[PDB]
Amino acid sequence: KFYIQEPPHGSPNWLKVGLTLGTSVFLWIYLIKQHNEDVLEYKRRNGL
Amino acid sequence: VVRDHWVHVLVPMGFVFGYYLDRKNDEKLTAFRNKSLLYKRELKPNEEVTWK
Amino acid sequence: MNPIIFIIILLTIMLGTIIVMISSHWLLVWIGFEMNMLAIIPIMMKNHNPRATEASTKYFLTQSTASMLLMMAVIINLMFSGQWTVMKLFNPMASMLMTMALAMKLGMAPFHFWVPEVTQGIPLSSGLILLTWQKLAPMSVLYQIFPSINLNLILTLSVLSILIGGWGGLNQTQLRKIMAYSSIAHMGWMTAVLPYNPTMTLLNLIIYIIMTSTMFTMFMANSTTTTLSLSHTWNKTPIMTVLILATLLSMGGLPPLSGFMPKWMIIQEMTKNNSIILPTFMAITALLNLYFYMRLTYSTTLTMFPSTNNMKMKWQFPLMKKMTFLPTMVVLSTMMLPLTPMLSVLE
């Protein structure tokens, strides 16, 4: 029940939560703009 | 949507989704639509493809 | 060992391996092996007990002997070509000596005797490095010298390793000795296909490392080193028994798991070259590996072994071990077969 010793993960580690969510968002944006860049380079090189 | 009956859409949706994916596969295999010797013909006035 | 000293020693183990893999000069290849051997020994002796001392001594004598044969090959090669470039060798005697030198470094049969003993005598974390990271450097050399390797010699070593690894693991109850003989058996597959397609040697090497890392990490998570100690895991962490089952079936090469992938691609390459008898013999003999993997799954997951009363105390504490990458490694060890065509990344 109410713990005799406060759990190490008793409360969220907001610094990690921010880093984790910020990294997922960052990687997702990086992936999408790369894919768009590759799509445009591909059309350019093939005369499309 | 109920709290007792939302798990009952999984299999029906899976069938509908699988059905949809099955028909999309046929869109990749139209190289011979209206080109086989056995069934090749002329399109009807409104028809665009013999089968889709 | 000071934590900073441990990190410096670990980075030197990696630096020696890296030097071997990036060197274009036989002298720097030899230096890389020597630097790697120097750094790993203190990791073996980290716990300072007579078994660690015996293990490190046996390891040092074997690796040091291999290096002398390795350098002999390099000097003979220099006499008969006047260069040091890392590539095919220009003398058959040099090729044999280098090939044997790398076989002893890998622990292939019949140079295998040290692998079971050294692995048993050192901790699990050190055993993980020995059976995984330490394979990279010798294999990276075989990958570059194979056009001059004697086919009969390399296939003989591969055949003996698969037989001795399979037979050797049948009699083992100690987990570290089970992993050691498994490693010997898997080394044979890597070298058997090397003359025909080096790309398949890398694939087997990578998949073997992922599966072997997964198993060692799970043994470390529970501090288990024997079959019976591992049989208590169902009473502590049931989930870990299912991961062990999936990983062990994978190391046995059973479809549709990932460990089937290397056995499958190696058989394809061998048959393309009209080698039919050898892959058939190899696949059947690998059933010995599956046998003593299956025993572990029986005593670990598919039955419930007797427990002890004191085990109840452990129910009240969580796992504190780092278990770094275990969620990723286990998924890769098991669910990778649908992505087999990705092996072209290694081409």
Binding site: - | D26, F32 | K272
Partner: protein
């Protein structure tokens, strides 16, 4: 599905599998020739790079 769709979907499937089958046979024969003659991008085992040689005049003439 009507027989015509399945019939002509089969012809599409057979075309792909026939083309793949021919390429598989061609690759085995190309690999056989490239390895035996060493005259292609595959099985191109490295030789010493010639840009490593120094062509400067040496301490002695006969070299």
């Amino acid at each position: 599905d009507g027989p015509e769709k399945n019939y002509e979907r089969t012809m599409a499937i057979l075309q792909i599998e026939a083309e793949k089958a021919e390429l598989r046979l061609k690759e085995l024969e190309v690999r056989r020739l490239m390895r035996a003659r060493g005259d292609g991008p595959w099985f191109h085992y490295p030789t010493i790079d010639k840009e490593l040689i120094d062509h400067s005049p040496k301490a002695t003439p006969d070299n």
